[PDB]
């Protein structure tokens, strides 16, 4: 497999046209305003730390590494590992899947404890119904890695409208120098630009690449659950592939 | 569990980066305007008192003690309770849980009136289907503690747009003094700043920390429902902890 | 069923903290603008009469009487009714309930014609499956009373933005007088204030006390639908109260 | 059966307060801008003609004839024809229901092809399973008549932001004339008013009169789906009327 | 079948009314701004590559060939193919469809492999149970081609508010020249016009002609799933079209 380069070139080339459109006009020393980086970056992170427990914000902020360097699941191997379990259950039975739990526990953590329940002797109606309520609450841990980045997309630009009115009321209070209305409005217009740079170029794409990586990795886990229901029913090994290549949209020769 | 310090440091360090950006430019004597605190705070909590019955607004406002000092339910004891109920039903039967009702009422009141129905001898199809509906209306109790703070977050800044114009119309009435437009536009802009200090830093984090505390305390309530369905069917103690450590994602040796 | 003063003191104390901030500014006659009360109120209510049929708007505006003077259903008599029907079914059977149909028809209209369908002898799969459809289409009588005040809350402020652009253009047409730019910008700024004082301080709380009046008066109907399915099956009276006190969070001594 | 006069006097009285408010301050010739009707009315009708197939827009833009002159289904006859079909069924069986299919096909096009299937002898589990799917995809014919006016309402004003900025950039590029900012800002402020007079007072009411004309025309269809299932099973004529007056909310003697 | 000329003539006629309003008040040499077509067109297309994997964005950005040149499925053949299978399945059995799969695979790729499962002998409780789940994941390939153009519809005008604020600050930094505010404010107001020209007249229709083209192509896929279930049960060819014309809304002679 390889790495999806869609998000690196998507944010590097979004911060490189925001950085060239500055160099095309003035310089890059006017747009650096340090006491207004903390009110949007340091403020939008801390005010969004209180919107979640401490454990769901430490994950959701350290979950960029699943946006930038994400590797899509090889679907031609999701099928092959189903026909590898299927033939194994018909060749050596179902009780001989215990020495291979750790092999499928490296494929994904849900196929590994769904075969452990298969060897322990639990009927499918209690495996397809416990591992379906475990997967729906495994993605609720992935929907909390997004709800952070859907909150930073809402708190970064809404903390610039704070860093502006804080830096705009201070200028109107004095207003005595007539040359303090020009530069005093630009410094108060940067804290908004940082709110629109980070929310649109950085925090919305990561809030979505974290969603298209959930709906894609849940879709593979929602296929293992349907095969295990058809693995223990003794279905033909060549039919659990054929019922998955159709289910995923993959061509098979 | 100790506590979730993700919201005390989340709302203080947001109100402490706001109070710095004010002290860096000037003094905070310019941003204190008392007759514009009683519209954003006094109004935003007055109109939001009318949006809910009185018993559902006194709860929603006093539901801050659940946002700030919240301690998440430890999933290592949500399991060691089901492993403690199951053996007490497998050893001494189901009718020997009368002496443990008030003790199983202390963990959570749902397991307390779900074993009381279990000892009376009501079939699982009712206790499983009543505690499913008793939870959905114990959930509408917590979704109103959040529906308040998602309404103050919509009325704190929307009573600033009223507190602005009420003080922005009088500035246009008497436009004789040329120096009455400077500070008059500053005072009429503070009542908008007070609306974004509260909606963004205080009312949205509490309208969410009360939601990530609902969805977590429901999953612990939802498992006790699924776990008792396995207790009246006479299952093993270790076959329900395994189906509940997988339904949560907890490690077991 | 005593009184809910949550909406009376919720709007009067919001129309006062507004009316105080206008009197503190110095004058109230500067905020009274008669040819702009007919465009925000006369427009927002007429342009929202066409968004509904005639009987869903006349009924939905006379539903402001259910926001102010609303009395929540006492959940200690929803229980003492179910324990009074089941105690009457176990004593006199079903056929001896003809003399009490009008008695329950005063509690709520659904229990009166859900016992009529019960006395007639219709199978429970048609009594429960119809009342679940009578109620599901009894909320569309209540979710319209909300959909009006949620359509007015979106048309009251967006019909003042028309009241502005009509008075903000007449001022820009005739700029010969420099004394018509100050007071002309205020009069065109009042119809924007009327748009936010009504929509956000009066028309949203009446749109939300009507939503918590539905969700609470449906929870009561959703029990009689269940408290009858358990009553015809010949269950004990003290069980249908125990299973209904738990679907409500009410204590039983 | 009369016609709903809730929209023909609801919008005509909305366009009569937006036109009286104009004639109070000045004249109407100041607001007539012909080369700006073609961006708001000519553009938002074209830019929303491309958002739908050519046949889903001719239906959606010709749905004003069903928003203005709509006559609500009288539920005092939906019940009388339900007890008329059953009394026609219990009298002469289900096969002799063919000499009236052309009579019930005139009531509504769904009761005509649901009785035509009732004569052909299809099982009642299928005449209801296709009709529930013939209806759920008969709303997608009605919800596409609504999705146009919920797309025009979002493209009438958002095409005023274009007609403004097109007429505001040409004024700034030619700011030599000092008297060109008085009328040049008014004429550029009308295309935003034409986008709020149509989207808010003409296309949002029709987008919500076609939604309340759907839910009241599906409620009658959805009752015929249940009244044909309770007729093949051979229920009394008096019960299918009693279960349908309670399913609609109509009083019976 | 033909080409839907609703988007190739309804967008071009909506890109001229945005272009004839420009040629009426001046020239286009004032609304052409090269260093600003790279922040909205070059930026919003790069900052929306990062929101999707590299394969789900190329699919959606190349899915305009489905908006402009789309061919509505002739529902008078969706019903004439069902009658072509049922008359061939009843005459020559189910097993004799092998010689005509590649024909039914060119109608649509879902009926071609749903018959391939029908010939292998899979029970309909796994064919319809797969082809209903193989269709729910055939939408996410179409629901992304929509989800891309609803993201460019929200990132084209969000990069205009960036291109403005970058072009509005470089003006306020250097405001010594009194003639540098006019032509400087117009150029900083074009980068916003370039956003609402594309996000409105180009990206909202393609995001909605891709949504009304999905609902029609998933409608035909859903009817095949409801016909094949009626084929394996061996229903008459005249009773599967009878339930497919009604399920589709088509007239049959």
Contact E130, E117 (CB under 8 A): yes
Of E49, E130, E175, which has the smallest distance from its Cβ to A182's Cβ?
A: E175
Three-class secondary structure of residue C50 per DSSP: coil
Nearest partner of B17 among B187, B153, B188, B200, judged by Cα: B200
Using CA atoms, how far apart are residues E156 and D43, in angstroms rounded to an integer? 19
DSSP letter string, chain B? ----TTTHHHHHHHHHHHHHHHHHHS-TTTT--GGGHHHHHHHHTTHHHHTS-HHHHHHHHTTSTTTSS--PPPTTTTHHHHHHHHHHHHHH-STT-GGGHHHHHHH-HHHHHHHHHHHTT--HHHHHHHHHHHHHHHHHHHHHHHHHHHHHHHHTTTTHHHHHHHHHHHHHHS---TTSSHHHHHHHHHHHHHHHHHIIIIIHHHHHHTTTTHHHHHHHHHHHHHHHHTTTTT--SHHHHHHHHHHHT----
Contact C116, C101 (CB under 8 A): yes
The alpha-carbon gap from C185 to the nearest alpha carbon of chain B, in Å, equals 7
- How many CB atoms lie under 10 A from the CB of residue C219? 18
Helical ranges in chain E per DSSP H: 12-25, 37-40, 54-61, 75-92, 101-107, 109-120, 124-131, 133-149, 152-155, 160-173, 182-201, 203-212, 214-232, 237-240, 242-248
Three-class secondary structure of residue D208 per DSSP: helix
Using CA atoms, how far apart are residues A168 and A170, in angstroms rounded to an integer? 5
Structure determined by? cryo-EM
DSSP letter string, chain A? ----TTTHHHHHHHHTTTTHHHHTSS-SSSS--GGGTIIIIIHHHHTTTTTS-HHHHHHHHTTGGGTTT-----HHHHTHHHHHHHHHHHHS-STT-STTHHHHHTT-HHHHHHHHHHHHT--GGGTTTTHHHHHTTTSTTTHHHHHHHHHHHHHTTTTHHHHHHHHHHHHHHH--SGGGSHHHHHHHHHHHHHHHHIIIIIHHHHHHHHHHTHHHHHHHHHHHHHHHHHHTTT--HHHHHHHHHHHHT----
Size of interface D-E (CB pairs under 8 A): 149
Using CA atoms, how far apart are residues A35 and B22, in angstroms rounded to an integer? 11
Give, to the nearest 10 degrees, the angle between helix C211-232 and helix C75-92.
20
Distances (CA, A) of A244 to A74, A186, A222, D89, E83: 14, 58, 11, 48, 29
Nearest partner of E35 among E166, E150, E154, judged by Cα: E166
Residue D212 CB-density burial (10 A; 0-12 exposed, 13-18 middle, 19+ buried): buried
- How many CB atoms lie under 10 A from the CB of residue C210? 27
Whether A246 sits inside 8 A of E137 (CB atoms) is no
**Chain D interface disruption, residue of C35, C169, C224, most D CBs within 10 A:** C169
Give, as one character, the DSSP assignment of residue D30.
T
- How many CB atoms lie under 10 A from the CB of residue E244? 25
Give, to the nearest 10 degrees, the angle between helix A143-155 and helix A203-212.
160
Token pair recorded at residue A187: 């410094």
Using CA atoms, how far apart are residues C210 and C139, in angstroms rounded to an integer? 11
Three-class secondary structure of residue E202 per DSSP: coil
Contact A166, B22 (CB under 8 A): yes
Whether C49 sits inside 8 A of D9 (CB atoms) is yes
| Nearest Cα residue in chain C from D73 | C53
- CA angle C137/C143/C145 to nearest 5° reads 120
Whether C170 sits inside 8 A of D25 (CB atoms) is yes
Scanning the structure block, which residue is given the tokens 């006009």?
A25
Distances (CA, A) of E130 to A231, A247, B117, B123, E104: 15, 6, 40, 35, 18
Using CA atoms, how far apart are residues E33 and E197, in angstroms rounded to an integer? 14
Using CA atoms, how far apart are residues E61 and E47, in angstroms rounded to an integer? 13
Using CA atoms, how far apart are residues D94 and D72, in angstroms rounded to an integer? 30
Q: Which residues from chain E sit within 8 angstroms of residue A201, using beta carbons?
A: 43, 47, 159, 162
Three-class secondary structure of residue E159 per DSSP: coil
Tell me the Cα Rg of chain A: 26
- How many CB atoms lie under 10 A from the CB of residue C29? 6
The alpha-carbon gap from C99 to the nearest alpha carbon of chain B, in Å, equals 31
Contact D16, D28 (CB under 8 A): no
Residue E236 region by backbone torsions, left for phi larger than 0, else alpha for psi between -120 and 50, else beta: beta
Three-class secondary structure of residue D19 per DSSP: coil
Contact of chains A and E by CB distance (3 or more pairs under 8 angstroms): yes
Residue B25 region by backbone torsions, left for phi larger than 0, else alpha for psi between -120 and 50, else beta: alpha
DSSP letter string, C91-138? HHTTGGGGGGHHHHHTT-HHHHHHHHHHHTT--HHHHHHHHHHHHHTT
Whether E200 sits inside 8 A of D120 (CB atoms) is no
Three-class secondary structure of residue D18 per DSSP: coil
DSSP letter string, E71-101? ----HHHHHHHHHHHHHHHHHHTTGGGGGGH
Using CA atoms, how far apart are residues E205 and D49, in angstroms rounded to an integer? 8
Phi, psi dihedrals of residue D2, rounded to the nearest 5°: -95, -175
Chain interruptions in chain B, by residue before each (C–N > 2.5 Å): none
Contacts of E52 (CB under 8 A, 6+ apart): A6, A10, A208, A209, A212, E60, E144, E147, E148, E151
Phi, psi dihedrals of residue B163, rounded to the nearest 5°: -65, -20
Q: Which residues from chain A sit within 8 angstroms of residue E58, using beta carbons?
A: none
Token pair recorded at residue E96: 């004799």
Using CA atoms, how far apart are residues D185 and C226, in angstroms rounded to an integer? 64
Whether B117 sits inside 8 A of C22 (CB atoms) is no
For chain E, the distance separating the N- and C-terminal CA atoms, rounded to the nearest angstrom, is 20
Q: Resolution in A, one decimal?
A: 3.4
Of C53, C163, C169, which has the smallest distance from its Cβ to D190's Cβ?
A: C169
Distances (CA, A) of E201 to D151, D158, E58: 12, 10, 21
**Chain D interface disruption, residue of C44, C51, C176, most D CBs within 10 A:** C51
Contact C172, D182 (CB under 8 A): yes
Nearest partner of B53 among E45, C145, C212, E22, judged by Cα: C212
Using CA atoms, how far apart are residues C26 and C31, in angstroms rounded to an integer? 11
The alpha-carbon gap from C244 to the nearest alpha carbon of chain B, in Å, equals 8
Using CA atoms, how far apart are residues A173 and A166, in angstroms rounded to an integer? 11
Using CA atoms, how far apart are residues B148 and E113, in angstroms rounded to an integer? 52
Using CA atoms, how far apart are residues A101 and E87, in angstroms rounded to an integer? 50
- Please give, one letter per residue, the 3-state secondary structure of D94-127: CHHHCCCHHHHHHHCHHHHHHHHHHHHCCCHHHH
Using CA atoms, how far apart are residues E162 and A200, in angstroms rounded to an integer? 9
Scanning the structure block, which residue is given the tokens 């963004």?
B200
Token pair recorded at residue D161: 């932001």
Contact B218, B150 (CB under 8 A): no
Whether C47 sits inside 8 A of D14 (CB atoms) is yes
Contacts of B152 (CB under 8 A, 6+ apart): B44, B45, B48, B198, B199, B203, B207
The Cβ-side half-sphere exposure at E208, using a 13 Å CA radius, reads 30
Distances (CA, A) of D130 to A31, C85, D101, E83, E227: 63, 40, 18, 17, 11
Whether C46 sits inside 8 A of D186 (CB atoms) is no
Using CA atoms, how far apart are residues E14 and D46, in angstroms rounded to an integer? 5
The b/e string for B173-194 (b: 16+ C-beta within 10 A; e otherwise) is eebeeeeeebbbbbbbbbbbbb
Nearest partner of C52 among C124, C150, C119, judged by Cα: C150
Using CA atoms, how far apart are residues E240 and E236, in angstroms rounded to an integer? 7
Whether E168 sits inside 8 A of A183 (CB atoms) is no
Contact D191, D157 (CB under 8 A): no
């Amino acid at each position: 497999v390889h790495m999806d380069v869609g998000t690196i070139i998507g944010i590097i080339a979004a911060f490189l046209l925001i950085l060239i459109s500055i160099l095309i006009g003035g310089s890059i020393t006017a747009f650096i305003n340090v006491p207004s980086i903390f009110i949007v970056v340091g403020g939008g992170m801390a005010a969004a730390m209180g919107a979640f427990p401490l454990k769901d914000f430490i994950r959701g902020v350290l979950a960029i590494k699943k946006a930038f360097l994400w590797k899509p699941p090889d679907l031609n191997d999701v099928i092959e590992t189903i026909g590898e379990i299927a033939s194994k259950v018909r060749k050596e039975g179902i009780l001989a899947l215990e020495g291979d739990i750790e092999l499928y526990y490296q494929k994904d953590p849900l196929l590994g404890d769904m075969i452990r329940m298969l060897v322990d002797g639990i009927d499918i109606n209690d495996i397809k119904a416990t591992a379906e309520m475990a997967l729906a609450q495994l993605d609720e841990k992935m929907s909390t890695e997004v709800a952070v980045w859907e909150k930073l997309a809402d708190l970064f630009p809404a903390f610039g409208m704070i860093g502006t009115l804080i830096g705009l009321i201070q200028m109107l209070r004095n207003l005595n120098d007539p040359s303090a209305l020009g530069p005093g409005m630009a410094v108060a217009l940067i804290t908004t630009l940082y709110g629109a740079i980070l929310a649109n170029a950085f925090a919305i794409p990561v809030a979505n690449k974290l969603k298209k990586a959930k709906d894609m990795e849940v879709l593979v886990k929602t296929i293992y659950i349907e095969a295990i229901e058809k693995i223990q029913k003794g279905e033909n090994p060549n039919v659990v592939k054929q019922e998955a290549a159709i289910m995923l949209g993959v061509e098979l020769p």
